[PDB]
Write a protein that holds these residues in place. Sequence first.
Motif, PDB file in Angstrom:
ATOM      1  N   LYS A   1       4.625   7.031  46.426  1.00  0.00           N
ATOM      2  CA  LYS A   1       6.422   6.685  46.219  1.00  0.00           C
ATOM      3  C   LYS A   1       6.565   5.908  47.181  1.00  0.00           C
ATOM      4  N   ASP A   2       6.801   5.873  48.779  1.00  0.00           N
ATOM      5  CA  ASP A   2       7.118   5.460  49.566  1.00  0.00           C
ATOM      6  C   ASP A   2       6.329   4.815  50.641  1.00  0.00           C
ATOM      7  N   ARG A   3       5.371   3.267  50.398  1.00  0.00           N
ATOM      8  CA  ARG A   3       3.537   3.710  51.309  1.00  0.00           C
ATOM      9  C   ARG A   3       5.010   2.649  52.760  1.00  0.00           C
ATOM     10  N   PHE A   4       6.294   2.714  52.995  1.00  0.00           N
ATOM     11  CA  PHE A   4       7.045   2.111  54.606  1.00  0.00           C
ATOM     12  C   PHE A   4       7.951   2.944  54.548  1.00  0.00           C
ATOM     13  N   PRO A   5       7.683   3.972  54.402  1.00  0.00           N
ATOM     14  CA  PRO A   5       8.737   5.085  55.197  1.00  0.00           C
ATOM     15  C   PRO A   5      10.049   4.718  56.085  1.00  0.00           C
ATOM     16  N   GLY A   6      11.128   4.103  55.777  1.00  0.00           N
ATOM     17  CA  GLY A   6      11.930   4.219  57.327  1.00  0.00           C
ATOM     18  C   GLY A   6      11.919   5.124  57.473  1.00  0.00           C
ATOM     19  N   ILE A   7      12.329   5.322  59.453  1.00  0.00           N
ATOM     20  CA  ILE A   7      13.147   6.371  59.876  1.00  0.00           C
ATOM     21  C   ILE A   7      13.074   7.600  59.168  1.00  0.00           C
ATOM     22  N   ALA A   8      14.284   7.121  58.365  1.00  0.00           N
ATOM     23  CA  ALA A   8      15.148   8.656  57.780  1.00  0.00           C
ATOM     24  C   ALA A   8      14.409   9.137  56.565  1.00  0.00           C
ATOM     25  N   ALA A   9      13.643   8.131  55.693  1.00  0.00           N
ATOM     26  CA  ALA A   9      12.470   9.121  54.714  1.00  0.00           C
ATOM     27  C   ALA A   9      11.761   9.969  55.523  1.00  0.00           C
ATOM     28  N   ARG A  10      10.726   9.483  57.191  1.00  0.00           N
ATOM     29  CA  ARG A  10      10.364  10.004  57.438  1.00  0.00           C
ATOM     30  C   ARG A  10      10.905  11.069  58.456  1.00  0.00           C
ATOM     31  N   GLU A  11      12.015  10.864  58.564  1.00  0.00           N
ATOM     32  CA  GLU A  11      12.334  12.123  58.789  1.00  0.00           C
ATOM     33  C   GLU A  11      13.258  13.452  58.107  1.00  0.00           C
ATOM     34  N   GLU A  12      13.535  12.709  57.112  1.00  0.00           N
ATOM     35  CA  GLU A  12      13.114  13.959  55.827  1.00  0.00           C
ATOM     36  C   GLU A  12      11.805  14.049  55.686  1.00  0.00           C
ATOM     37  N   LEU A  13      11.249  14.270  55.266  1.00  0.00           N
ATOM     38  CA  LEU A  13      10.329  14.332  55.435  1.00  0.00           C
ATOM     39  C   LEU A  13       9.269  15.142  56.829  1.00  0.00           C
TER      40      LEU A  13
END
Lengths: 53, 54
Positions: free
Chosen positions: B18-30
């Motif tokens: 879905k997203d190969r380079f998660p920004g700090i948000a994508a990761r925080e969510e994850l």
Amino acid sequence: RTAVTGSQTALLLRAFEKDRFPGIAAREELARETGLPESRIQIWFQNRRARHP
Amino acid sequence: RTAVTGSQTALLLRAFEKDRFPGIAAREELARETGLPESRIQIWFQNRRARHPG
DNA sequence: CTAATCTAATCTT
DNA sequence: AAGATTAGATTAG
């Protein structure tokens, strides 16, 4: 295309413990002492200030 | 402390494509979706970027 | 196989 | 020059 020798590392650590902010004067010297580009030595000092304050 | 379960692995693997380079948000969510620190999610993605592209 | 770490480097303000 | 972050090498489960 470069991995650093332990001696270069020891020589940079010594210069580090001396004064962590070598002006371009010190660094050019340290480039000659080591056989590394000056550019690559600045990076070394920038990273080490960030990971060992 | 370590030891990610097959289920944690399952949802990150999906998010991976879905997203190969998660920004700090994508990761925080994850981090919330899985219950692992964001720091450990980053390591997981950067390790896997190096050991399995495509 | 996989998590974690340490290094070399790049880029942004 | 700091801060974050990338890739890469390696140290270990």
